[PDB]
Amino acid sequence: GWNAYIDNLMADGTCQDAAIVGYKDSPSVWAAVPGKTFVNITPAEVGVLVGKDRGLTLGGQKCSVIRDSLLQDGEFSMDLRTKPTFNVTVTKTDKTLVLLMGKEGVHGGLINKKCYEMASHLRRSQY
Numbered sequence: 001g002w003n004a005y006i007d008n009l010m011a012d013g014t015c016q017d018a019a020i021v022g023y024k025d026s027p028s029v030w031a032a033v034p035g036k037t038f039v040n041i042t043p044a045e046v047g048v049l050v051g052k053d054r055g056l057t058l059g060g061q062k063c064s065v066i067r068d069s070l071l072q073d074g075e076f077s078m079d080l081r082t083k084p085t086f087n088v089t090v091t092k093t094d095k096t097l098v099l100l101m102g103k104e105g106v107h108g109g110l111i112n113k114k115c116y117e118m119a120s121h122l123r124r125s126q127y
Contacts, residue, residue: 002031017101023050024095037061038099087111091119095127
């Protein structure tokens with residue numbers, strides 16, 4: 001029930017988009033918010049995110065990388081901004097990418113916190 005995690009991420013009303021995306025072997029969106037951006041994330045875009053070469057695009061949306069610690073052990077998260085702009089945080093679990101976009105005026109620190117904590121939750125189930 002991957003949509004449950006999307007629903008919880010979208011519950012407080014301060015996030016406008018969220019997604020859980022598998023990146024092993026054949027990247028694909030496992031769950032996202034319909035009619036938004038992250039539902040259109042391509043495997044090619046995922047490849048950029050988890051690649052060795054470290055703007056970028058997420059489902060067509062041009063983004064600017066603020067802080068990249070995604071492949072970094074202990075953190076595994078990346079903060080971006082849509083090129084009114086919105087804070088974006090991507091966090092890497094054992095098999096997925098958790099993506100979170102905040103609404104206007106929402107702190108990047110909050111989006112990072114929510115995404116980071118949601119990813120820790122997923123890792124507890126070995127995902």
